[PDB]
Amino acid sequence: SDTPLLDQIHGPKDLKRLSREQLPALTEELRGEIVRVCSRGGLHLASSLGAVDIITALHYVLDSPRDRILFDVGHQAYAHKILTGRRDQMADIKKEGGISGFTKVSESEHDAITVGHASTSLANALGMALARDAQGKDFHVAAVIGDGSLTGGMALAALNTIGDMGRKMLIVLNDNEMSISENVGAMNKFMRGSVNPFAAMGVRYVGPVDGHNVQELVWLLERLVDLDGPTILHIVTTKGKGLSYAEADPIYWHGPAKFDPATGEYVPSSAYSWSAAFGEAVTEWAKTDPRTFVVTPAMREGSGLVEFSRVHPHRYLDVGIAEEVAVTTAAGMALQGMRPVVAIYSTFLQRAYDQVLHDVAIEHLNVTFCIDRAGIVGADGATHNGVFDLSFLRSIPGVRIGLPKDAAELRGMLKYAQTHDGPFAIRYPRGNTAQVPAGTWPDLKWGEWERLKGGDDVVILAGGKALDYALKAAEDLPGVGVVNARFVKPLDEEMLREVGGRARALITVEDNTVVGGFGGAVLEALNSMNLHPTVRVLGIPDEFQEHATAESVHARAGIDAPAIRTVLAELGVDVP
Amino acid sequence: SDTPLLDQIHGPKDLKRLSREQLPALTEELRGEIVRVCSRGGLHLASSLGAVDIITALHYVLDSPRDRILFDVGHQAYAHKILTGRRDQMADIKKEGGISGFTKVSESEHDAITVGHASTSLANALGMALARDAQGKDFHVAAVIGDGSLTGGMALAALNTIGDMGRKMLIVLNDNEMSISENVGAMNKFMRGLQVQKWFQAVEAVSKPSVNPFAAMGVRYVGPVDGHNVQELVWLLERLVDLDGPTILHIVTTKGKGLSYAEADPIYWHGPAKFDPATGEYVPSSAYSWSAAFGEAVTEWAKTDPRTFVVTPAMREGSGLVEFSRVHPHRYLDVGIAEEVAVTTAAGMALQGMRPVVAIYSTFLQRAYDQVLHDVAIEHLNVTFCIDRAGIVGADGATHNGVFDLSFLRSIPGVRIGLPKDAAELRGMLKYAQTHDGPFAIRYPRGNTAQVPAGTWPDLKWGEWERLKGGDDVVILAGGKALDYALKAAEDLPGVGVVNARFVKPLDEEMLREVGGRARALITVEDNTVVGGFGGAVLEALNSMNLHPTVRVLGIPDEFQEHATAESVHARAGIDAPAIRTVLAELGVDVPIEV
Ligand SMILES: Cc1ncc(C[n+]2c([C@@](C)(O)P(=O)(O)OCCc3cn([C@H](Cc4ccccc4)C(=O)O)nn3)sc(CCOP(=O)(O)OP(=O)(O)O)c2C)c(N)n1
Ligand SMILES: Cc1ncc(C[n+]2c([C@@](C)(O)P(=O)(O)OCCc3cn([C@H](Cc4ccccc4)C(=O)O)nn3)sc(CCOP(=O)(O)OP(=O)(O)O)c2C)c(N)n1
Ligand SMILES: [Mg+2]
Numbered sequence A: 001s002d003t004p005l006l007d008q009i010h011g012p013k014d015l016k017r018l019s020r021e022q023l024p025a026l027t028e029e030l031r032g033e034i035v036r037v038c039s040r041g042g043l044h045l046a047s048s049l050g051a052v053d054i055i056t057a058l059h060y061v062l063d064s065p066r067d068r069i070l071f072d073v074g075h076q077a078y079a080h081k082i083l084t085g086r087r088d089q090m091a092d093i094k095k096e097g098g099i100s101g102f103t104k105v106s107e108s109e110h111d112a113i114t115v116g117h118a119s120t121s122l123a124n125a126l127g128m129a130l131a132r133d134a135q136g137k138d139f140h141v142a143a144v145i146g147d148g149s150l151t152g153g154m155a156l157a158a159l160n161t162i163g164d165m166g167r168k169m170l171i172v173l174n175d176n177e178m179s180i181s182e183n184v185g186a187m188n189k190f191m192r193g194s195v196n197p198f199a200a201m202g203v204r205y206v207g208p209v210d211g212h213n214v215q216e217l218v219w220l221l222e223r224l225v226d227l228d229g230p231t232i233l234h235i236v237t238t239k240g241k242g243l244s245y246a247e248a249d250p251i252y253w254h255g256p257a258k259f260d261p262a263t264g265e266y267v268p269s270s271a272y273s274w275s276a277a278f279g280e281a282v283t284e285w286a287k288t289d290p291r292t293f294v295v296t297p298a299m300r301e302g303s304g305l306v307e308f309s310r311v312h313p314h315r316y317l318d319v320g321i322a323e324e325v326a327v328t329t330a331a332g333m334a335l336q337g338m339r340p341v342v343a344i345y346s347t348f349l350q351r352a353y354d355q356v357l358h359d360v361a362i363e364h365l366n367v368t369f370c371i372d373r374a375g376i377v378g379a380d381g382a383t384h385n386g387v388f389d390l391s392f393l394r395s396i397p398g399v400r401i402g403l404p405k406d407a408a409e410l411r412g413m414l415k416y417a418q419t420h421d422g423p424f425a426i427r428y429p430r431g432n433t434a435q436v437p438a439g440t441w442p443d444l445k446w447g448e449w450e451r452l453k454g455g456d457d458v459v460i461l462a463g464g465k466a467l468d469y470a471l472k473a474a475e476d477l478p479g480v481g482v483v484n485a486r487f488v489k490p491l492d493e494e495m496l497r498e499v500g501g502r503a504r505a506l507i508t509v510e511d512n513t514v515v516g517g518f519g520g521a522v523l524e525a526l527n528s529m530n531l532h533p534t535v536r537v538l539g540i541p542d543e544f545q546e547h548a549t550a551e552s553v554h555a556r557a558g559i560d561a562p563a564i565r566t567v568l569a570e571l572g573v574d575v576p
Numbered sequence B: 001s002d003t004p005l006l007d008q009i010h011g012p013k014d015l016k017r018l019s020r021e022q023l024p025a026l027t028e029e030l031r032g033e034i035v036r037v038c039s040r041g042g043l044h045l046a047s048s049l050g051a052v053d054i055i056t057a058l059h060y061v062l063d064s065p066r067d068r069i070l071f072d073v074g075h076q077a078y079a080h081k082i083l084t085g086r087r088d089q090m091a092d093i094k095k096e097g098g099i100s101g102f103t104k105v106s107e108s109e110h111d112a113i114t115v116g117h118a119s120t121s122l123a124n125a126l127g128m129a130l131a132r133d134a135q136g137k138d139f140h141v142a143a144v145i146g147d148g149s150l151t152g153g154m155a156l157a158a159l160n161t162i163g164d165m166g167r168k169m170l171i172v173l174n175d176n177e178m179s180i181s182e183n184v185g186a187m188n189k190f191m192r193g194l195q196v197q198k199w200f201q202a203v204e205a206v207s208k209p210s211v212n213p214f215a216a217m218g219v220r221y222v223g224p225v226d227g228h229n230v231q232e233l234v235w236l237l238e239r240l241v242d243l244d245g246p247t248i249l250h251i252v253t254t255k256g257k258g259l260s261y262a263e264a265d266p267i268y269w270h271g272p273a274k275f276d277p278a279t280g281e282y283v284p285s286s287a288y289s290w291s292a293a294f295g296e297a298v299t300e301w302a303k304t305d306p307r308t309f310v311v312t313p314a315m316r317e318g319s320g321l322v323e324f325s326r327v328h329p330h331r332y333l334d335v336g337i338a339e340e341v342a343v344t345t346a347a348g349m350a351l352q353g354m355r356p357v358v359a360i361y362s363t364f365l366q367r368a369y370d371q372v373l374h375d376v377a378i379e380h381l382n383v384t385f386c387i388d389r390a391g392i393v394g395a396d397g398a399t400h401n402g403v404f405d406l407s408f409l410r411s412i413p414g415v416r417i418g419l420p421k422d423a424a425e426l427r428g429m430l431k432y433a434q435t436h437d438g439p440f441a442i443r444y445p446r447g448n449t450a451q452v453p454a455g456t457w458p459d460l461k462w463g464e465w466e467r468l469k470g471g472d473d474v475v476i477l478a479g480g481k482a483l484d485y486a487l488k489a490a491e492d493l494p495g496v497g498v499v500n501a502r503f504v505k506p507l508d509e510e511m512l513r514e515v516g517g518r519a520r521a522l523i524t525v526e527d528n529t530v531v532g533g534f535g536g537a538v539l540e541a542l543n544s545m546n547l548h549p550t551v552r553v554l555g556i557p558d559e560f561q562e563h564a565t566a567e568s569v570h571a572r573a574g575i576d577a578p579a580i581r582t583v584l585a586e587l588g589v590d591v592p593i594e595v
């Protein structure tokens, strides 16, 4: 066996039987294990490699699950799961029925918080420490937060309260100068250069120290965890530590495809994502529109903006992991005559709900939202599934919402949004779509749907990913109409009145929760028109969806093509 | 006239014609004017009094509307409106048809941002500065932010970006150590030990011909300086606004400066009732608010439940928690103006076996949407939300009307939602939430309700509605404030049923199926937007049951509601008792005519 030490470790108690001089050899076994686990692709390789040493030291010094160790985001905690009885389960991580890719309270007593969104560790740790003190208990509370997660407002404000309350707790700042891209912000710049950067926070500050010296970290943790008041242990790590290819390019190896550990060669994703279609469109648009300015909250790569940032460096802003700052900064730009575009994932847009409502919508400002990862994202599970934006955006006055069926319709909606007054949201899923020629800028009327298949018996209303399911479902069913419901706000009131009054039954399909989303909008509009057709609302149930493929989630949610055909048969359609 | 200088000032241009030595006399006129404006009650007296001198200095040095002066919250900007052509309109401020109580872009070219929620000034200012630089323009950008607003995460994160971009802009930190209550947080404690610097007489001006609390932000830091020395503020602003990179000017002000009663108690005088400026005596609010009913209930509950822990984001007074904080000091937490921290801290408490209660206004709960969804709901944690100012709040207008919580909470899996009709039902819902698994939200309006005896703790079944008026022909479904309208509307209409729909999540599926299948028409009423709220929930449930009765959904339209009385907003929205009677007549009910 290549891992003699790890073979005897089934929990933190087994780990403590090792001597301190054996810990360096253990971290090497852990790194090799993490490399093999991630070699199949789609996992958080570089972040978990960087955190191996601090995780080993923390579990060697602390007594989990009696002590609580909290991970921010949780993507860097593969060594934590390997050391807490889940080594064998790492083979199926993020697979349906397997363990989560992040720490999850229901999965293990050793997982103190359920995470996926960034910057929640500090407020969670404060609550646990206050609860401990209120109950008269004495256990240790420790939080591991990266330099990227520290840019979030809810981490900075929580630290302000933590310094005020002065309770026993340890914060490990895992500083590798990386987020997904290189980290941004003034704090990141300041820390690159004997002063306590958190002196105004009233928090004890130790470091920076070598985040890969596992024996020194153990020695340090032993002399800090029992001190009075909160402490920040600032460690410096190399993202991807232990794999030369990952250290050289920590951006790609943050989430590599299937790769060969001996050569570093990986499967290039030669697909054309929706993200690349947006990036191509907005890079093209900004060439002729000097008012366009793109803001991302730390997702230049995921949103498809690498080429944009290179071609338009003076129209690009990365605010770090601060979705709230991204939206309100865009509002200020719109107030000064710009045409800002906020590129943001649906799940992360949840963080900026009040900024959309209060800072953008009240004055009806010219902010365009290009919303990636809309709908079920799949393997990242409940913390990342973007199945709520059709509900929470819809109830904001003046926020228009569109769902493009392809890249040409995306360009048409972006063009409309950038040339018309007020806020517009354009949401599209994880996945691929056909490339269109440069200069494709069709004119569309916002709010007008388009019928794609004839039929008056039963008519399916769907947009985006749900529309692909609907067209496939009605593929061989004459008389089943399909309408591209590419606008959720406003609805096509004229076509809905006509179709709702003439059809015996309607089906709405949405890659969104059924609660208050597109189906609810259709029912509200039909009621206002005093029309009462039979309607089957298909969508994600009012339940969080665990990690699986999006197709599996959609099959069990009842929105894929076979599920629609079953509903069609229930409505009396002659399905073969 | 008592105000000879102000009588000749109709804008910043007139102000600049004064000499610097006349500015102290002008601030005295402005303070007297603000006191008279606020004497009718219901206005932000102490904050605007504290900000008189910095506002006068900013308009004397800068050139609004060419330069942009941004106010965080905007409640401290009465002197700003008086100096920008709105002096006469101050008599009708926050009244329907009058000017807003906060700065508003559509109201004046001098109002750079529309505000009400705190901590938005810094990100807005950053966007304006980036837009200015992208367009090649050269105007000044200045933001005024209080020490309370600086506790918000979106202000701290924006400052981190502001230091990174390094653009020309000025941030005035208006530090009075007050939020509503005394300010909290480590930054407030740290700045208490900072000594005031004397620049204009000129010790500090000679020293540079001592620590920066924002050193890690890469921002120039000047101060703290006397925030009431208007000539020194002018002298400082002239020598700062044209420098490269961002600057924080830290000023120290006294909340309520100029009125002895307000300086002595800046908490009450943050928003005083009708008062006599010569005596300081004010009309006491002898009413019993929903806030007081919640405060009494949770203070009583925590005596027998050591797991209860109340968290507020800087709203101890408004949420009714003053007595709680005194009776249960070790079970009370104020996180500052950081709703996001309040909810996630409560999540951490629930994970360690506590029974936290988050007290929060509906409009401010919007700030914590993701923390409710991601940090509380995914693991179905024991957080109870007691939501004040639910529905239309009225005079504070669009930035404060809490008409969205029945929509954004309803689509979060596992979040139960209740609307108590009175204090006994509030206690019943609080009792249920604190003894059952998962998150619960209890929302109630600004306004009053009868006091109930101590020890009132009824048992209710969460999710069960209660019929209050007989009738199967037409049935009104409403809860909370909307229910009072419904009962008043059907008061003399036998056969018009009224159901206390006191639970929005879940609905009473059993009663809705029976009533929806037997009634020819239903009316839903909600103090909430009609988009995705209670009416939408009923339509979704009726559709799942394949029931198609006539349904009239009454609620707030899909439009922001400007400042007015709640009664005026509800009259025009169509949910008050006369509007319901009109709908009943449209549905064929024999409603007595008035002729
Ligand atoms: C509030 C908020 N805002 C943003 C984020 C996003 N984010 C985090 C993550 C885990 O969602 P993300 O990986 O981006 O997955 C976003 C969703 C996603 C998934 N796929 C996969 C491809 C794939 C990607 C990554 C790994 C494996 C496969 C696909 O589609 O095939 N593509 N995209 S992590 C981080 C930096 C932390 O920086 P630090 O705190 O310094 O930590 P450090 O790594 O340096 O140790 C950031 C910014 C967040 N959490 N929360
Ligand atoms: C995200 C967020 N969270 C919270 C707030 C609340 N808040 C602000 C306000 C203007 O809503 P609020 O007044 O509380 O009105 C809240 C709504 C409200 C209205 N009535 C009236 C009673 C009344 C109150 C006030 C004036 C007049 C009458 C009623 O019903 O009869 N009762 N309640 S102001 C501030 C401190 C800033 O501190 P600083 O930044 O340091 O400024 P400083 O004052 O020191 O100069 C805070 C915390 C906010 N903005 N944004
Ligand atoms: Mg990092």
Ligand SMILES: [Mg+2]
Residues within 6 Å of the ligand: B146, B147, B148, B174, B175, B176, B177, B178, B179, B183
């Ligand atoms: Mg203050």
Ligand code: NA
Residues within 6 Å of the ligand: A365, A366, A367, A368, A417, A418, A419, A420, A421, A422, A423, A424
């Ligand atoms: Na626009």
Ligand code: NA
Residues within 6 Å of the ligand: B381, B382, B383, B384, B433, B434, B435, B436, B437, B438, B439, B440
């Ligand atoms: Na509970």
